[PDB]
Amino acid sequence: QFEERHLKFLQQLGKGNFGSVEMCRYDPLQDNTGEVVAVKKLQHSTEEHLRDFEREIEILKSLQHDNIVKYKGVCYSNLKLIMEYLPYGSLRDYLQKHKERIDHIKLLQYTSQICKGMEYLGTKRYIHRDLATRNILVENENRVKIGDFGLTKVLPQDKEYYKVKEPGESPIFWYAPESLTESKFSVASDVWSFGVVLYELFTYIEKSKSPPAEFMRMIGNDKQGQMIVFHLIELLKNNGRLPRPDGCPDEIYMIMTECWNNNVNQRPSFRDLALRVDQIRDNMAG
Numbered sequence: 247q248f249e250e251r252h253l254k255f256l257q258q259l260g261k262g263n264f265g266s267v268e269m270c271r272y273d274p275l276q277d278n279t280g281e282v283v284a285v286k287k288l289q290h291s292t293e294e295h296l297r298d299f300e301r302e303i304e305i306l307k308s309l310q311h312d313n314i315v316k317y318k319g320v321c322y323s324n325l326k327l328i329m330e331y332l333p334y335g336s337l338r339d340y341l342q343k344h345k346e347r348i349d350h351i352k353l354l355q356y357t358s359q360i361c362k363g364m365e366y367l368g369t370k371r372y373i374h375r376d377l378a379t380r381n382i383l384v385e386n387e388n389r390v391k392i393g394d395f396g397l398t399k400v401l402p403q404d405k406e407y408y409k410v411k412e413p414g415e416s417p418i419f420w421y422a423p424e425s426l427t428e429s430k431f432s433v434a435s436d437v438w439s440f441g442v443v444l445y446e447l448f449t450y451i452e453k454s455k456s457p458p459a460e461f462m463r464m465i466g467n468d469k470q471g472q473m474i475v476f477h478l479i480e481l482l483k484n485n486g487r488l489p490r491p492d493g494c495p496d497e498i499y500m501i502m503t504e505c506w507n508n509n510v511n512q513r514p515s516f517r518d519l520a521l522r523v524d525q526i527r528d529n530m531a532g
């Protein structure tokens with residue numbers, strides 16, 4: 247395992263209401279020859295939260311895939327998860343800061359990798375429940391990985407869905423309708439979220455174009471607080487949806503819209519999604 251005493255803090259990478267990822271240097275020989283790693287820890291340890299963190303760590307440990315962040319180990323005294331440090335960080339920040347270097351063909355390469363990373367999860371009956379460009383990491387120009395599994399749940403053997411309602415704030419603007427109204431999470435709800443990820447990528451993370459910004463405008467910025475979800479549910483029930491990002495090809499937007507089907511069973515699989523995207527990639531290549 248990794249010793250507490252040998253992990254040097256360098257900087258904070260992410261923060262939340264119950265988590266944090268810091269950039270650290272694991273220098274066991276204290277001779278500045280150790281590698282830099284990412285360490286995630288609970289922002290406010292609660293036994294409930296610690297139990298989930300334990301399961302999260304097992305989830306990631308059971309995953310080994312080119313498009314999934316690598317698990318390096320744990321750190322015991324306050325549990326700490328030691329992962330590989332992807333130098334380009336989140337896809338959300340990367341994309342926003344370097345939009346001039348990333349074209350549509352690249353966005354589709356990232357898109358395809360995310361699909362293969364999600365198909366892999368589904369193969370283990372794992373439901374991510376939190377896909378968003380802020381947890382997709384960039385190893386390099388050409389490689390992205392799903393980098394966080396803090397809300398990931400395993401489907402029970404007898405059901406094709408999982409019900410859960412965790413205390414606090416949820417990323418509602420990425421949630422499928424049945425997840426908002428019924429707290430139901432499945433591969434299909436992951437596909438709904440995937441379509442929001444696709445949207446994100448093609449907006450190049452323009453601040454006014456984010457899902458929250460776009461939905462709040464549709465709902466009405468003069469909105470309340472507990473009633474926000476209620477209105478969001480109505481808006482999606484009447485087929486209201488995120489607009490086609492600027493410069494986004496009609497064939498890409500249709501993939502997004504198909505992922506955003508109210509009919510849970512009518513949404514495409516991650517395999518077919520990879521298929522259509524790779525097809526489009528080729529059609530743009532030659």
Ligand SMILES: CNC(=O)c1cnc(N)c2cc(-c3ccc(S(=O)(=O)NC(C)(C)C)cc3)sc12
Nearest residue numbers: 259260261262265266267284331332335381394
């Ligand atoms: C510049 N390089 C980096 O920044 C970097 C390098 N290596 C990594 N492995 C990671 C992982 C990151 C991350 C960031 C937010 C979330 S999150 O889903 O929002 N969850 C919280 C905030 C509660 C932790 C998950 C993971 S960034 C990053």
